[model samples]
Target: EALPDFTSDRYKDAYSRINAIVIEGEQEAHDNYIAIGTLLPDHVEELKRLAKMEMRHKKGFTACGKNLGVEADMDFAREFFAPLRDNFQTALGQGKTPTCLLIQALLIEAFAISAYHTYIPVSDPFARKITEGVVKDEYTHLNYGEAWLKANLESCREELLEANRENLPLIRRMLDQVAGDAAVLQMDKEDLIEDFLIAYQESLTEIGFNTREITRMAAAAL
Candidate 1:
């Protein structure tokens, strides 16, 4: 029944890093979309629009940290994101559309939505407001990816499956890495995982994966 004392040392200390991670995540999402725009030339404008929203989200999260008088630890966040960043860069370099879409649109978007959703009820008023709006935008982005992948499912099936095999584990690792900080911020680990599964599994289903296929893909995160 008690909310975190948002101004307390414990809350601010844990928030510094968690805040930094989301800020960096948003910035990375922007860049990933821009890169994807280049890969899919016809959708350049559309992706650019999404990238622009990501920048706004980044700024909003930055302000959330500032509202608490907490300066985010950008250095720690940069390294925290390195593995997933490297995987994305590698996929973009090879012009792997399926992998790129899977990583940025599906995985990262779902990850953001899950964490933000979990944090919303526990977050400070300022952050809760920002996250609520940001979550709406994220669903739109996720929908874009799901629709594209769904339409091209026949051709991209193998690539999507392979990409999931490689990247889902990375998400699992990332979640494990952040769990402690998240708990310190009053976000429950089980709730975060449950929200993620809902978004992710639903997206897979939207992308036209049948029950068996969805089960197989979901197992990769295990």
Candidate 2:
């Protein structure tokens, strides 16, 4: 039997949503790398790798749009990147801490992995392959960030814990604002969001980070 008709309007809608997300996510990653450039000087290699991987993912989604006979807006890259650049600048203005910065990075990578896993089974072969590869690289990046956090935990515990406590609420509020805006784009995929939260919690737990407050905050945010 032929594969189920996976190129219908609904499929295109979903694909477009996913593509928008990847585009925004790549911009965030790019902006964040610049934000923490000085703090994590050694992370340049990993940051560049992730940035390129995100570009590749964006390319795949652009290809998907083409294959579906739809044209993606070339302006999406600029629009997506600008806000992220502003956000990163805001974060930098608040004085960076190693633990807090890494935690933020971890959150981004976890979200990326969750996005790929959610989209993998339904995505076309080419998109699936691209997402899987990006996910794998994200996993490596997550590991590196986690290990760095672990190694510094003893020295950074008090500050890290305090920072998280202070930041979680703010982050949750930020997420709420972002999520609300995302909904306006007709991209409110709760399943994807929940998957991202689950992966995020797991990663935090592995590093002995308390996500209980954040989880509640996230629920409220959603």
Candidate 3:
């Protein structure tokens, strides 16, 4: 589906590349859980829960990736996130402001929310159950990030907002590109995006956020 121009091509490329990386990373996480299941059976319940969530996410991405004609590569897990990890480490090393770290955390949680909402509708019975469980955990993750931001808003608002604004265009571009790629592999589900957006907006509104502002932000980024 078509979307208005969001921003720089570099940002878009970065977004798509990171998204592909996230897909692979999620798969590797699941693989790790599978290994852990045997090694740490005492934590099997908790580990399996996390593993199942990752597996569900991996499955969703795999389905979408297949549509995008992108092959899943485990190596991307390390290669793609290396820059982000380096940036985080650099901040820690220098004892400089760790704004990037917080922003990355927020973005990760936000993307998880988006991913859950995107797949929830299309998922089959078992998949939906698995995603629903993940959604619950993701909400907790979102809460943690948002609570931290709220606590530091006075000091970090500008930096946090700046990061989000800078990243929004990139996020849109990548999602659009992935959608386009997936479309070529399978029929495009424009309705899925719309449905997800609407539901997400309602969710924000219910939580006392300004839906208009959220929509406006999305439009501006796009």
Model 1's number of clashes is 0
Off by over 4 Å in 3: 1-71, 75-98, 124-126, 181-222
* TM-score of candidate 1 against the unseen true structure: 0.98
lDDT of 3 by residue, 1-222 (tens): 243222434333433444466576566555544544453457578656766777677676555534434455545446644544454445444443324434343444455566556655544454456557667766554454454455555675455445446554554544564565333323244643554455434433433446565666456465
What C-alpha lDDT values do all the predictions have? 0.92, 0.59, 0.50
Per-candidate clash tally? 0, 0, 0
Q: Per-candidate TM vs. native? A: 0.98, 0.68, 0.52
On lDDT, the candidate that comes out on top is 1
Whole-model lDDT for model 1 versus the true structure?
Answer: 0.92
Q: Tens digits of per-residue lDDT for model 2 on 124-176?
A: 66666666767776777677667777677677666555545544444354345
| Residue-level error in angstroms, candidate 1, position 186 | 0.6
Q: Each candidate: RMSD to true structure?
A: 0.9, 4.9, 9.7
lDDT of 1 by residue, 1-222 (tens): 257899899999999999999999999999999999888999999999999999999999999999999989999899999988999999999999988999999999999999998888888888889999899998999999998899889998999999999898988888898999898898888888888888999999999999999898999887
Judging by TM-score against the true structure, name the best candidate.
1
Ranking by lDDT: 1, 2, 3
